[PDB]
Amino acid sequence: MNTVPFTSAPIEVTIGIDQYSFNVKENQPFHGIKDIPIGHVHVIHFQHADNSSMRYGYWFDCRMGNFYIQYDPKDGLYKMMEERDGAKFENIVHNFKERQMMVSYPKIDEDDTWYNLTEFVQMDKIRKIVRKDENQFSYVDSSMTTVQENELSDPAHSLNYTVINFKSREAIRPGHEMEDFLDKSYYLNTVMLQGIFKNSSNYFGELQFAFLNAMFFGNYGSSLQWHAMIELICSSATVPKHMLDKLDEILYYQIKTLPEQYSDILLNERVWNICLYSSFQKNSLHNTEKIMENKYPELL
Amino acid sequence: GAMNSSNYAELFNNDIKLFVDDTNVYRVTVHKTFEGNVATKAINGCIFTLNPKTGHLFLKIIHTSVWAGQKRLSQLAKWKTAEEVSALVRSLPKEEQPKQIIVTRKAMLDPLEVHMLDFPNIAIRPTELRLPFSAAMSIDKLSDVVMKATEPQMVLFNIYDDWLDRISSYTAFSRLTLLLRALKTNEESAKMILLSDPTITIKSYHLWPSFTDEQWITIESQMRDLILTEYGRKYNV
Ligand SMILES: CC(C)COc1ccc(C(=O)NN)cc1
Numbered sequence: 001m002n003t004v005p006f007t008s009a010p011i012e013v014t015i016g017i018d019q020y021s022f023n024v025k026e027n028q029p030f031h032g033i034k035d036i037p038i039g040h041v042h043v044i045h046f047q048h049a050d051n052s053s054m055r056y057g058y059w060f061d062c063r064m065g066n067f068y069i070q071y072d073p074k075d076g077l078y079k080m081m082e083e084r085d086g087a088k089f090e091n092i093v094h095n096f097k098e099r100q101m102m103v104s105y106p107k108i109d110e111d112d113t114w115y116n117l118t119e120f121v122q123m124d125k126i127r128k129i130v131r132k133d134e135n136q137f138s139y140v141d142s143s144m145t146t147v148q149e150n151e152l153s154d155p156a157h158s159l160n161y162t163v164i165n166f167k168s169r170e171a172i173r174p175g176h177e178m179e180d181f182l183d184k185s186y187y188l189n190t191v192m193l194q195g196i197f198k199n200s201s202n203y204f205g206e207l208q209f210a211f212l213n214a215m216f217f218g219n220y221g222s223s224l225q226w227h228a229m230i231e232l233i234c235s236s237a238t239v240p241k242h243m244l245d246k247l248d249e250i251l252y253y254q255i256k257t258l259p260e261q262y263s264d265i266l267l268n269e270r271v272w273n274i275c276l277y278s279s280f281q282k283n284s285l286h287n288t289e290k291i292m293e294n295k296y297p298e299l300l
Numbered sequence: 301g302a303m304n305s306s307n308y309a310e311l312f313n314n315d316i317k318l319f320v321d322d323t324n325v326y327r328v329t330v331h332k333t334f335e336g337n338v339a340t341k342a343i344n345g346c347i348f349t350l351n352p353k354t355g356h357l358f359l360k361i362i363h364t365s366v367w368a369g370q371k372r373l374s375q376l377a378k379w380k381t382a383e384e385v386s387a388l389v390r391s392l393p394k395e396e397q398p399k400q401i402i403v404t405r406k407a408m409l410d411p412l413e414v415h416m417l418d419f420p421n422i423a424i425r426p427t428e429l430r431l432p433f434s435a436a437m438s439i440d441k442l443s444d445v446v447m448k449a450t451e452p453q454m455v456l457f458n459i460y461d462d463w464l465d466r467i468s469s470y471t472a473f474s475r476l477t478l479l480l481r482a483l484k485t486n487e488e489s490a491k492m493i494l495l496s497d498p499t500i501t502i503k504s505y506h507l508w509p510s511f512t513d514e515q516w517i518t519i520e521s522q523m524r525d526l527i528l529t530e531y532g533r534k535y536n537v
Pocket residue numbers: 303304305306307308311429430431432477478481
């Protein structure tokens with residue numbers, strides 16, 4: 001069980017850790033989060049009380065280093081930093097820990113929610129989507145745009161998701177125009193899976209990361225990416241059976257975790273109705289269709 | 301974007317553009333089978349691809365053999381249309397290729413866009429107003445070449461005959477569209493109007509009769525009357 005200590009909490013802020021969140025008051029004695037499960041990526045995220053604009057946060061894996069948070073009064077945000085002095089870090093944490101000034105990652109033992117949302121998400125792939133190579137952790141916020149959004153403006157601060165575009169030469173073989181547009185299996189299986197992602201685990205990992213950035217930061221380009229990756233599978237007549245069964249589980253837990261009051265802006269009516277009711281895979285997502293119909297029957 | 305009713309003149313500028321109408325590509329007769337079920341029999345069709353500035357018509361004849369053994373023919377017809385338009389563009393010298401292609405039905409947008417990915421600078425555009433090109437098969441010489449075709453074939457026409465020697469392309473297109481709307485609303489009456497006088501003939505190299513300027517005004521007035529009438533006969537006014 002690992003720890004992310006805080007130097008202090010000088011400004012009032014709602015702090016999220018994965019799917020959990022809690023409020024910290026201005027100058028409240030608060031020195032971080034303990035008992036963070038090893039084996040998963042995690043995200044620690046922030047919304048200031050005075051400016052609910054800009055949700056921002058940091059993806060990290062405690063196996064990769066000792067990380068802490070420190071507010072920067074010049075840049076006006078809580079920053080993640082790595083502590084290289086391993087003994088300095090252990091000593092800081094233990095002091096905050098015998099003084100019980102940290103909150104405990106509040107995992108119920110029955111509860112596989114975070115695993116189920118991050119099953120295929122790896123830090124090394126996150127760091128290729130979010131390029132800042134001198135840090136082991138990755139910053140994301142509400143306003144960051146994607147490489148594809150930039151093609152339609154600062155490249156260093158972009159989300160480099162894999163570009164998916166159904167009306168592109170990459171997606172459409174000369175002479176198979178109608179075939180490839182109406183059945184996207186070539187683009188899914190040859191171009192994306194064999195060609196770019198190499199395997200379905202990396203595909204699902206990017207899909208899961210896109211969803212999480214959409215949900216936690218309201219990042220619009222991430223939501224676009226998530227829906228494109230779903231639609232590419234659902235619009236393929238030929239998908240490996242284990243991928244469909246896994247997709248159904250992935251989306252089930254995503255739909256289960258979505259705040260009820262954010263469905264209006266985070267769920268694209270066209271994609272979901274197409275995927276569940278018109279697409280080749282309309283009959284292959286039983287768990288996802290059932291939770292969607294019982295939780296968001298309006299959208300459909 | 302979509303052509304609205306506040307840009308009529310854009311049709312007649314000097315940017316090459318073609319209209320593409322697919323409504324006569326997939327044509328069937330519906331009939332009863334011996335068992336009393338219903339079946340379709342396809343008949344020859346055509347893509348209507350028209351330069352509105354010059355009157356040049358690229359009539360790609362669609363022979364019924366193209367449907368043999370195919371499923372979902374109404375869907376295929378849109379993609380076949382887009383394939384043939386793409387092939388036409390590629391066959392033209394670069395300086396004759398269109399800068400815009402306007403489709404008369406919005407269901408042609410994605411098929412044509414996908415077939416024209418190689419031409420990113422050719423704009424594919426929708427029509428905020430439906431055209432009367434479906435009536436092209438009421439032009440006797442066009443209908444004849446389509447129905448006589450025994451194989452796929454492209455035939456080139458000037459749908460304005462020699463009108464541009466005397467009138468502008470705006471006026472020629474308004475005449476063509478007034479004639480086509482007449483033929484669509486009441487074909488027999490429209491055709492009666494056009495041929496009633498046997499001393500006015502259709503030249504061998506023309507589609508329409510050799511009306512003088514004055515006779516065209518009378519004709520045009522008769523077509524307007526027909527359309528207004530039918531519009532009463534239809535709505536009882
Ligand atoms: C390119 C659009 C602005 C013009 O569209 C039309 C032009 C003419 C007609 C017609 O039937 N006239 N009789 C219908 C639509």
